[PDB]
Structure formats: C-alpha cells, structure tokens
Design a protein around this ligand. Structure first.
Ligand SMILES: *[C@@H]1O[C@H](CO)[C@@H](O[C@@H]2O[C@H](CO)[C@@H](O)[C@H](O)[C@H]2NC(C)=O)[C@H](O)[C@H]1NC(C)=O
Ligand SMILES: *[C@@H]1O[C@H](CO)[C@@H](O)[C@H](O)[C@H]1NC(C)=O
Lengths: 123, 183
C-alpha cells in the first residue's frame, strides 16, 4: 500500500477529467487478454503499453493542436504517461513483459484507475 | 454527416477560442453564433489548422457571460449538413496563470494577482521544502493570501479557477511560475 499507489491513482484521476485529442487513439487491451496472469505482470504490461503509446504519439501532430492550450494539455499527457510508466514498472519489479498484440486510451486508463482504486481500497 | 464538436473556452475574459477536431474527417468549414434571448453573425477571426479551419476566435466585445450562447457549424458543399450547440460561458472560463508572486516575512505571506478576475477566482496553492517528497497543496478563498526555516528551501506555486461565484467553470488555470525561498 505504497505512496506510489496513491500517486498512480492521483495521476489517473488527473488524466480522466480532461480529455485530449489523443485519448481516442487505440492501445492494446491487456485486461481481457489476461490468462492466469499475476498482478505484477499486469502492472508491467500496463506500463509497457503506455510506454509504447507516448513514445509513438509524443510528436504526433494530431495530438498537438493549434491552440496554446491544446499543446499544454498534450504536454501534461505525455508527462503523466511517463510518470505512470515508471511508477507501474517499479511496482511490478519485472525486467520486461512484452505485450505484443485493442482499446481506446481513455477507456484503458479508466479501467486501470479502477484497479488501483480497488487496490488502495484493499489497503 | 456528422459534424465535429466545437470546443469553446473563455481565457480570462479577454478572447474566446472556439475549436474543433478537423483531423478526423474524410477531407474550410463555416461558423456562426448568436446569443439566445438578447438584442446571427459570422466569425470575424478564423483559425486555420493546415489551411483548413481549425476554429474561431471571439474578441472581448463579442463575449457575453450570463447570456445563453449558441453556435452553428456548417458545411459549404452540403449546407443541410450543420450542427447547433448551446453553452453556458460562465462555466467555460479558464483564467491566466497567477502572476507577480511575492513573499515577505512578518509568518510568511504569499501573494499573486490577476487582471480584474480577482473576485471571481478560487485558488489552490502548492508548497514544499528540500526535505519534502510530496507537494503540499492548500485551497484558498478569493482573498488570495496564504500564510505559514531558512535551513529549508521553500518552493511555492499556485493556480486559480472561475468558481463558484461568477461561474461554475470546471477547469483550472496552468501552474504559476514557481517562487522560491530559503538557503
Ligand atoms: C487561441 O487562438 C489562437 C489562434 O490559434 C492561439 O494562438 C496560436 O498560438 C500558437 C502558439 O504556439 C500558435 O499557433 C500561434 O501563436 C497562434 N496561431 C497562429 C498565428 O497560427 C492561442 O494560443 C489560443 N489560446 C489559448 C488556447 O490559450
Ligand atoms: C480556406 O480559406 C482560406 C482563407 O480564405 C484560403 O486561404 C484557403 O485556400 C481555403 N482552403 C480551402 C479552399 O479549403
């Protein structure tokens, strides 16, 4: 029941409230694909996908709008996504879990935030 | 069919950006607006994303809060393809990040300012020392005054929101440039 857990929930909370242009872009859904997979594996696989997303879409122009605020919104998105990638990776403590091979980013996050809230609820 | 949705925000009641996602579409779109229950016009300032309309901008003279605001997007080739939207602009306000941060001992007091938005705004202040892992955030009234070691190095920052008094707006302004103290 780490402080990280809290931060991960806060970051997810912060991510869900305001939607971006990128949030509709797809990412592999690892929750329905779970076969006897351990919590660590999930956290790891969750992080893995996010890492792949923000590395791919960081420079994406669709995600960067014309407005100065659309730029700012996206900038905090990548920032937060990176934050989660590190926090989630550390919780799993696995050296890697390639997910290979979909879901809406915002839907994925919404599902993830639910797990964390149930985890934090537990402890 | 169908049309994209328009995102309208009023920035510290100076100008208003009205945008939409042009990127999702098969292939210049027209925008008109009017105020319901008042005494239709064309957008005088067009924002272009890739030489096709990104959105529109309304200057202060054209902006009226507490007056029902209505917008109509339309397609030049297929005029019968169009959409209308009604907005509460007092809920759409997003103030600039607080400026002119100041600190003086007395018992430390922090101060920031805005242009004529001071009575509408609601603030949240964050602070930490070199000895702190986490940001300590403290909500503030529209009064905008905060109170509280030279061995510890202090860092303050704050943002504001248009709420509740002048409006119900959800979104927070960006974080003000951090102010420092100590060591
Ligand atoms: C609102 O509308 C205007 C017009 O798009 C925005 O100003 C643009 O700001 C970015 C800054 O990088 C650049 O595209 C140009 O400076 C402006 N547009 C041009 C000339 O192409 C402004 O940033 C928006 N206000 C917000 C959302 O805060
Ligand atoms: C849209 O309008 C602008 C300004 O009038 C013009 O420069 C541009 O060529 C137009 N693009 C089209 C026809 O989609």
């Amino acid at each position: 029941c780490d402080i990280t857990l809290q931060e991960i929930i806060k970051t997810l909370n912060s991510l869900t409230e305001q939607k971006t242009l990128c949030t509709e872009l797809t990412v592999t859904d690892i929750f329905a694909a779970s076969k006897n997979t351990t919590e660590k594996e999930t956290f790891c696989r969750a992080a893995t996908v996010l890492r792949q997303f923000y590395s791919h879409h960081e420079k994406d122009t669709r995600c960067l709008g014309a407005t100065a605020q659309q730029f700012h919104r996206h900038k905090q998105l990548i920032r937060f996504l990176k934050r989660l990638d590190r926090n989630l990776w550390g919780l799993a403590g696995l050296n890697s879990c390639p997910v290979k091979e979909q879901s809406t980013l915002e839907n994925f996050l919404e599902r993830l935030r639910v797990i964390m809230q149930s985890k934090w609820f537990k402890c | 069919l169908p049309l994209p949705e328009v995102q309208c925000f009023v920035f510290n009641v100076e100008y208003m950006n009205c945008t939409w996602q042009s990127s999702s579409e098969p292939q210049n779109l027209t925008l008109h607006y009017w105020y319901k229950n008042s005494d239709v016009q064309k957008c005088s300032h067009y924002l272009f994303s890739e030489e096709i309309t990104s959105g529109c901008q309304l200057q202060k003279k054209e902006i009226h809060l507490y007056q029902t605001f209505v917008v109509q997007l339309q397609d030049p080739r297929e005029p019968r393809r169009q959409a209308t939207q009604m907005l509460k602009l007092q809920n759409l306000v997003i103030p600039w990040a607080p400026e002119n941060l100041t600190l003086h001992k007395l018992q430390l007091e922090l101060n920031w300012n805005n242009r004529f938005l001071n009575h509408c705004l609601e603030h949240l202040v964050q602070y930490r020392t070199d000895w702190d892992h986490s940001w300590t955030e403290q909500s503030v009234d529209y009064r905008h005054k905060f109170s509280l070691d030279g061995q510890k190095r202090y860092t303050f920052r704050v943002r504001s929101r248009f709420n509740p008094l002048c409006g119900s707006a959800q979104h927070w302004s960006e974080w003000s440039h951090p102010i420092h103290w100590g060591s």
